[PDB]
């Protein structure tokens, strides 16, 4: 079966996707990452607060048509600049 999922960015952006219930979400993640041009290291995908691993499947996560996935930016702050 096909299912549609929405990926909300922290900037109000929303992107729809269509995949089979048994497709590893890694595809959805590299996809989004490419289209918006971001670094994977710099972002986090979450489904109802819980992380999503590249092997997870919309079926395992028990996602449903039109369910929403959140994407957030890494939370850091400062940067240490060591000299010599």
């Amino acid at each position: 079966d096909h299912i549609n999922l929405k990926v909300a960015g922290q900037d109000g952006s929303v992107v729809q996707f269509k995949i089979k219930r048994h497709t590893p979400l890694s595809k959805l993640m590299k996809a989004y990452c490419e289209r918006q041009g971001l670094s994977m290291r710099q972002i986090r995908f979450r489904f109802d607060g819980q992380p999503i691993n590249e092997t997870d499947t919309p079926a395992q996560l028990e996602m449903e048509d039109e369910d929403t996935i959140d994407v957030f930016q890494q939370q850091t702050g400062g940067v240490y600049l060591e000299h010599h």
Binding site: R41, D48, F72, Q75, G77, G78, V79, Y80, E82
Partner: protein, 226 residues
Amino acid sequence: DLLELTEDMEKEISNALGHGPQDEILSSAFKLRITRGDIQTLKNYHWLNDEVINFYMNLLVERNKKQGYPALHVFSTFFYPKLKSGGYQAVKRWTKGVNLFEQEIILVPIHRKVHWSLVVIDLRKKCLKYLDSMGQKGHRICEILLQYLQDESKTKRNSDLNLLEWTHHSMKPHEIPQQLNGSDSGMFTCKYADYISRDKPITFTQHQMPLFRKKMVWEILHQQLL
């Protein structure tokens, strides 16, 4: 509290922080995959990122449970922002399957512009303190949260909260660290969490931060607190 480190420990910590594939994953659990890059944010003088903090908060929950401590619930460091922006309906599902009020202690790590802080909501004495190693006040933050608690209790339990008996709190002027480096805010947020989840009064100071950092990389590599 503090301890010494085994030479073996010291090297294992040394190698995690040492050079290597930044994206190599050194510890996995809670669906988090901590990479060299992540653990490196515990190097002295570095700011902790969110992966390090969420991993640690989860170990606190497992620790508490295995040592007979109070039932602990920890929100992702992304909960509060998404609540700040989209209101309750935006995070209502983040407690899917869990009964917040059957827990005793709830921890809410909060990322501020450039520094970390924490909120502890004590469901045993309708309490709510905001601990900020930078001296700041958590007003919006605390109010924005009790309200969430209100909404959660209605949507999920269908009972209202008595926001009247729910009293804030802000750490007294003398509990705020002198040195004041945002760089260490994530360590204070974690240690405050550690102690507070245990009922152990906050005795540590900023001098113990560099040791606490080495300890914490070992605790994450082994997924076990010392």
